[PDB]
């Protein structure tokens, strides 16, 4: 474990430290700036019976923070604070993305950016433009995250660089329905040489037809392709710490099938209000608004409400960073039941 160059929320470090120290019934000797001109914070704490732990917390010029507990008189104690602070960080913050997707033009990219900034914690700026390259920044100031998205106009190459955090998650979610199997695989597994392309599509297809049952022949072509590609990605997925993004094909399909269904019941879903203009939210589940529910059978109301609720809760959990494969499969199975019911 390295405590160098961490992406800590600087304004939260002292509070997190004091809370950790209080939870342990340790005592503060001091918390304040370091000697001289050194940038950062020094925390000195202890408890009766052992010596003082000094933890030096260096603020680096790039905005990251390096924790040094290998100093002072009580390093085993200081390491407890270092690990507390380390464990405040989402594991994904330690990953890097720098990928290129082929076959993109500005009129296809721009709507994805605009959709993405419909999220409350997401904004984007056009960072630079010339005849060869347009560069955009997607920014979550809330979380401290920024993603650089560059379209190389003359080659059609769309480059995504940063970390796989909230900006990446929102952008790739909205990009996902445009991508071919290989692109979709790249954004979901974040690796360069995936094996989805060697999965026998007809076998996967048969799996899907089995789950969809009665709904299968009513599946929209676009929904069937997204689900089957997604199934290939799950089937060839490498060993990952987290498989949650492998639920993107299901969630995106629900979004499409659901919009299509409520538009067909005279409830068109339009940005920027989105689904919100149709739902009220009681407890942990959403329910349809009376003006709209009045036009529907109770069954329709229930399927639509369940679908929107599952979509919203799972997606919110993904966009806000909140057996592993078996758990994922439980979620995907549920999502397939939902899609099926949407088709009735």
From Swiss-Prot:
Induction annotation: Repressed by IscR. rnlA-rnlB forms an operon, the downstream rnlB also has its own promoter.
Alphabetically ordered keywords of this record: Antiviral defense, Cytoplasm, Endonuclease, Hydrolase, Nuclease, Toxin-antitoxin system
EC number(s) given by UniProt: 3.1.-.-
InterPro entries, sorted: RnlA/LsoA-toxin_DBD (IPR043994), RnlA_toxin_N (IPR045837), RnlA_toxin_NRD (IPR031845)
Predominant location category: cytoplasm
Subcellular location, record wording: Cytoplasm
Disulfide-bonded cysteines: none
Recorded GO MF terms: protein homodimerization activity; RNA endonuclease activity
Pfam families hit by this protein: RnlA-toxin_DBD (PF19034), RnlA_toxin (PF15935), RnlA_toxin_N (PF19417)
Disruption phenotype: Not essential, slightly smaller colonies on minimal agar plates at 30 degrees Celsius. Strongly reduces RNase LS activity, restores growth of an enterobacteria phage T4 dmd mutant. Altered mRNA half-life for some cellular transcripts, including an increased half-life for an internal fragment of 23S rRNA. Allele rnlA2 is due to a premature stop codon at residue 33. Sensitive to high concentrations of NaCl, sensitivity is eliminated in a crp or cyaA deletion mutant. Increased levels of Crp and thus increased levels of cAMP.
Enzyme class, spelled out: hydrolase
Subunit composition and interactions: Forms homodimer in solution. Forms a complex with cognate antitoxin RnlB and with enterobacteria phage T4 antitoxin Dmd.
Domain description: Composed of 3 domains, the NTD (N-terminal domain, residues 1-90), NRD (N-repeated domain, residues 91-197) and DBD (Dmd-binding domain, residues 198-357). The DBD is responsible for dimerization, growth inhibition upon overexpression and recognition of T4 antitoxin Dmd (via residues 327-357) and antitoxin RnlB and subcellular location.
Purpose of the protein: Toxic component of a type II toxin-antitoxin (TA) system. A stable (half-life 27.6 minutes) endoribonuclease that in the absence of cognate antitoxin RnlB causes generalized RNA degradation. Degrades late enterobacteria phage T4 mRNAs, protecting the host against T4 reproduction. Activity is inhibited by cognate antitoxin RnlB and by enterobacteria phage T4 protein Dmd. Targets cyaA mRNA.
Protein name: mRNA endoribonuclease toxin LS
């Amino acid at each position: 474990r390295s405590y160098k160059n961490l992406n800590l929320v600087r304004a939260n470090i002292e509070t997190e430290s004091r809370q950790f120290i209080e939870n342990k019934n340790y005592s503060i000797q001091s918390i304040g700036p370091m000697p001289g001109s050194r940038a950062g914070l020094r925390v000195v704490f202890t408890r009766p019976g052992v010596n003082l732990a000094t933890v030096d917390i260096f603020y680096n010029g790039d905005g990251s923070t390096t924790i040094q507990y290998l100093t002072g008189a009580n390093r085993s104690l200081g390491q407890e604070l270092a690990d507390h602070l380390f464990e405040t960080i989402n594991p994904a913050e330690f990953e890097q993305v720098n990928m290129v997707l082929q076959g993109f033009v500005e009129t296809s990219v721009l709507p994805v950016l605009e959709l993405s900034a419909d999220e409350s914690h997401i904004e984007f700026r056009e960072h630079s433009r010339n005849a060869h390259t347009v560069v955009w920044k997607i920014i979550s100031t809330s979380y401290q995250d920024e993603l650089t998205v560059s379209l190389h106009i003359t080659t059609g190459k769309l480059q995504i660089q940063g970390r796989p955090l909230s900006c990446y998650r929102v952008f790739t979610f909205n990009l996902a329905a445009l991508l071919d199997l290989q692109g979709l695989e790249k954004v979901l597994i974040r690796q360069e040489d995936g094996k989805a392309n060697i999965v026998q599509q007809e076998v996967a297809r048969t799996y899907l037809q089995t789950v969809m049952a009665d709904a299968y022949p009513h599946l929209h072509v676009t929904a069937e392709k997204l689900l089957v590609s997604g199934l290939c990605v799950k089937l060839a997925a490498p060993d990952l710490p987290d498989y949650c993004m492998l639920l993107y094909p299901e969630l995106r399909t629900i979004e499409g099938v659901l919009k299509s269904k409520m538009s067909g019941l005279g409830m068109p879903v339009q940005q920027p209000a989105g689904f919100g203009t149709y739902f009220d939210k009681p407890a942990a589940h959403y329910i349809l608004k009376p003006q709209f529910a009045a036009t529907l059978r109770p069954e329709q109301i229930n399927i639509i409400s369940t679908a929107y609720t599952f979509f919203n809760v799972e997606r919110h959990s993904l966009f806000h960073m909140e057996s592993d494969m078996a758990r994922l499969m439980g979620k995907a199975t549920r999502a397939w039941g939902i899609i099926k019911d949407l088709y009735i």
